[PDB]
Symmetry: C4
Subunit: 333 residues, 4 copies
């Protein structure tokens, strides 16, 4: 595999069409899904030359842990849909690569099993109609050694995924929500979580500048600027288009991550030059899992690590902090 | 049906090609017809998160009536071209959905029959060479219980519809203007109508900011920002591209509706975020009528209602007023 | 024929490929040829409503003559390439339509024969190595009743027309320059012409704002903002993209015409809304001549007249002066 | 051959696919390779008219030598890949055309042999792990009569060329680096070179404005604004998009060249109108070499000379300095 696109082809061969569609699809007309890619393709980096590259490092410190890359595996529900080892295969590869893995509320293996893999994982929370179950998931996650609570705030309910409707997609009998329905989360829910844990709370799905400011005021340790991979509001702006304005507004008050459409180390570089602390990567990790299990995810993460190192050094950046100081220019594709 | 596009396919199968072309076509090169869609596709919404969505409502009050959605059925002439029940099928479905229906001057069933369906309808006026016939239509409409006069001001004559010319299209013998030629309307005509009725007068086909201001000064209760679905001046700007400037200029002095290219609940959301009070929907309603009569229109309106509720809640909006306060960002498609 | 595009298809059938290529082609990669069309397609008109259209007139006064439309036939060399009656067929149709016809220096019928058709024609000058021959053409033109000298200033030599090179195109033996090599014209040449005639001198091929100003200072009665239909410098900006800036800079000091890509009455409207006094139309007139001779040109001019009247009235304009006061908005195609 | 594109077709026929891919390809997704062309296609020139063109000259003085065109042959490694005479064929054609030729560090014929061809050549330096070998190449180049040191600063290592990876491309046994591994160059390396030679040092691969300023402060005689033909950082901005800002920032303190995507005389004109002193041309020279050896390169340079003269004169420019004073306008393609 020499690009992430090699893995999408591999995953399309092996997966059943309706599972590939569950993974690939977006809501509505898939306008936001496509725009996540268009928006990255329009960003060009202005590289610097003639800097010392003796010790290029792609490491970052985030939420109290060193990570090997400015990247984490996005929360993706039901990973046994893609491979029989599901979440355990992905979490093992992430651990071995030094990349944080986000354990999902809708994981198909229990969060305690996945946390036992090691690797200092994060836990993604959905707010539930039964509030007490949500705060219990939080405490379970903390008890199992998760290091951050990624509270997904853009799913008061699931978006309208027309591929899934047209396919009549449902979970196979052999795939379940192993940690066991949505209630809309509010700022009150955020405060209840913040009071229930000393772990950093990261709000995932923020796009408005005012909501990023309010997240800092609410005591969030981070946000993920995100339109949920184009799967929630169809017509929601790409996170990458809001990222620079949001980074300026929070002015270092929390970590600002971005996701949606990251498909190479060069894309990681673009996100960091626009001011991201780190990115999440979703679909490509599942392509690698579908294609070749744990080893597939290992190969993807090694490829991404090589691409990130290559892009940083070609742009004159010996550290991720230097990459955040790069300038960009919008172009035409 | 899971999108409005399902219905266009269904209508293309059943209708004669020349009737499908009468419905689908625009004037000239169809530049404005295409631009209505391009313009909406370029608008992205910046959704808000973590708001109270306990009681999401899509209702609005407009021209003294509660409507179930910020939407009305656009005036489309000669609906018996599309289905034998024509206007009565559409008006019954609109009534049952709580959506205003606009009765046309060129309706193929008389305005009194359509008004008898109920549902508090509106009436669309064309100015006629014989002025007295125009003011008589207005009084007929008012006597029959119509609740607003939608004065179409962008048809001094019909545009050059090249599909119709190439098809040699004419009305079948079985379709007539049942209320029974154009004269250009002027601001004097508007005042004559305003003096003849206490109903709100809504000027449909406004695109210039100055004309929107003058409409308020003339005592209009509303305007529809519109290029007539690309059927009048070819090269006229889309209404959606003028809407924000027009909403700022009238500064609440009348209702500001928009039409042209609305094809989903997400499109309704975009229009409201740009400041529209409500939208009109034309061709999709006729697709549903062609495909399946009254039940088809019912299914379309239920689908649009679901999409509007979904989009509003995903964007953090418990009311249409909140959706009007959303911000937008132009993107590249 | 219901659009100008009907005539291009008709002309492509009948003409030999290499003559069609001489007519259709541009210089280099044909970037400026394509951009002439792209630029018009990006312009949208903001029409006005509810104006008095009792007596819509498309007439203008220009260079001391009433013209029936804000349009003249562009100078196109060697019209016997397209039809055996060549220039006489076109000039007769232009006369009968009330449209000025530009007699070319490289006409395939002598300028005195074409002027004898009547219709108050214009004469297009190329500067010649032998200056005295240029001033003699001017005096011949004036003696024959031409009413303006259109001095083409963008041909110090002919551009690189790669279709013609690839075809090895040459004039058939039966087509000659009947008025009988280029020398670059300079501002000194302009003054020599201005001193030799009392007719208005119109400089065709101006694109820089400073050159439009200097044209007024030099005593020009008009300019044609033009990149020679994309046939001269490949990569030259379209005239339509410079027109608004040029109209503001000359601030009524001369007539400002534009050409390049005009293919409908709506395009004429766009040009006038951007401030043009009038347009020239080149290739479509030759398509009509190829397709059907004098009658073909008559049909084209009647179609353009109908489209101009239609577009003006739909945009609320009872006169060309009102159309020049319309506003425009750039869009995305 | 009537355009440079004729030669690409000719070279694709004759070369082995993997050698054509080595020549044509870029890094990553080839976004920067494509953007080099898109960026030029968006630039339109505003030509001037009616200027004296008695003695149009395309000559420039650069680095103490008159050159026949504002163009040099870019450094392209391993030219025996394309033709058995490799660098000697290209250097002979460049000499005879009066165009500087850049001898590569990775030339497949020794730099002393190529310099013996004559034509006052330049020498392109890569910094080597063994510094002393780099300064020895510099002194060899100077001893052999090279007139400038083109220090390539955008290759701390080679980019990820996915075509080459997919092809498993390696040099044939018959092609070697005849002057005989990378170390990252720094500003210290630049100073070491500047101290080792009195020849002008030209830094190739600058894109950031600050790096162009620093190059002047470091005593560079020139820079090449360049993304290495899209072969280094994928997602690096095109040089042509940075050129105007860089020319303003250095404000005559060094020569500012540009490369990437130059494919005609019109493209040379665009680059000069954006302020370049001169361009480099890479792939087209290798197409001509592949197609027809020395004579092929001669034909390409004669074609480019004709196109540059044509474009300059059509734009009213009797000298390259006048072309640098032309204005441009961005358009839409
Ligand atoms: C592709 C995919 C993404 C997601 C999910 C499933 C799939 C198949 N999950 C759900 O389906 C939730 C549900 O079923 O309601 C899910 C989720 N986000 C989250 O917080 N919890 C989730 O549990 N996401 C978005 C994700 O984390 C990234 O935001 C996006 O993947 C970045 O974009 P890319 O894919 O272009 O890298
Ligand atoms: C598709 C269609 C539209 C219209 C009509 C017929 C058809 C087949 N009517 C006429 O043909 C009038 C005539 O025959 O002179 C008609 C009319 N508008 C109006 O005031 N009175 C009309 O009587 N319109 C425009 C409409 O109300 C919306 O402005 C547009 O449909 C929103 O765009 P969309 O279709 O993308 O939702
Ligand atoms: C299509 C065509 C145009 C022209 C010519 C021939 C053809 C086949 N003539 C020449 O070939 C001159 C030569 O042989 O050196 C010619 C000329 N302009 C001029 O002053 N004198 C000419 O004698 N033009 C440009 C024209 O007048 C318009 O500028 C352009 O046509 C508007 O664009 P459109 O075509 O999109 O409407
Ligand atoms: C096409 C091609 C270009 C280059 C190379 C090989 C090929 C096949 N060289 C290398 O492969 C170096 C390596 O092997 O590490 C090479 C090089 N630049 C340089 O300083 N030294 C080099 O030795 N370039 C870039 C060049 O000089 C121009 O920047 C670019 O070609 C302008 O763009 P265009 O091609 O669109 O005109």
């Amino acid at each position: 595999y020499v690009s992430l696109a090699d893995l999408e082809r591999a995953a399309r061969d092996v997966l059943p069409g309706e599972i590939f569609d569950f993974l690939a699809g977006g809501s509505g007309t898939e306008a936001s899904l496509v725009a996540n890619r268009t928006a990255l393709e329009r960003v060009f980096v202005i590289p610097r030359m003639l800097r010392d590259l003796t010790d290029v490092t792609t490491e970052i410190d985030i939420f109290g842990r060193r990570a090997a890359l400015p990247m984490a595996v996005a929360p993706v529900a039901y990973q046994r849909l893609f491979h029989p080892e599901g979440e355990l295969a992905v979490a093992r590869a992430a651990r071995d690569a030094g990349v944080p893995y986000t354990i999902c509320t809708l994981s198909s293996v229990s969060l305690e099993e996945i946390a036992a893999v090691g690797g200092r994982p994060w836990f993604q929370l959905f707010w539930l109609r039964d509030e007490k179950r949500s705060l219990d998931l939080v405490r379970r996650a903390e008890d199992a050694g998760c290091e951050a609570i990624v509270f997904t705030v853009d799913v008061p309910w699931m978006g309208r995924r027309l591929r899934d409707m047209r396919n009549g997609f449902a979970l196979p009998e052999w795939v379940t929500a192993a940690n066991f329905e949505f209630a809309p989360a509010t700022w009150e829910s955020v405060e209840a979580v913040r009071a229930h844990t000393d772990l950093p709370v990261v709000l995932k799905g923020i796009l408005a500048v005012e909501d990023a400011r309010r997240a800092v005021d609410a005591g969030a340790g981070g946000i993920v600027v995100s339109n949920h991979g184009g799967r929630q509001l169809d017509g929601a702006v790409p996170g990458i288009e809001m990222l620079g304005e949001i980074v300026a507004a929070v002015s270092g008050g929390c970590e600002v991550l971005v996701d949606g459409g990251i498909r190479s180390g060069g894309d990681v570089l673009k996100a960091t030059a626009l001011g991201a602390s780190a990115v999440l990567v979703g679909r490509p990790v599942m392509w690698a899992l579908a294609a070749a299990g744990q080893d597939g995810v290992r190969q993807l993460l090694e490829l991404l690590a090589e691409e990130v190192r290559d892009a940083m050094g070609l742009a004159g950046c010996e550290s991720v902090g230097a990459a955040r100081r790069l300038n960009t220019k919008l172009g035409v594709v």
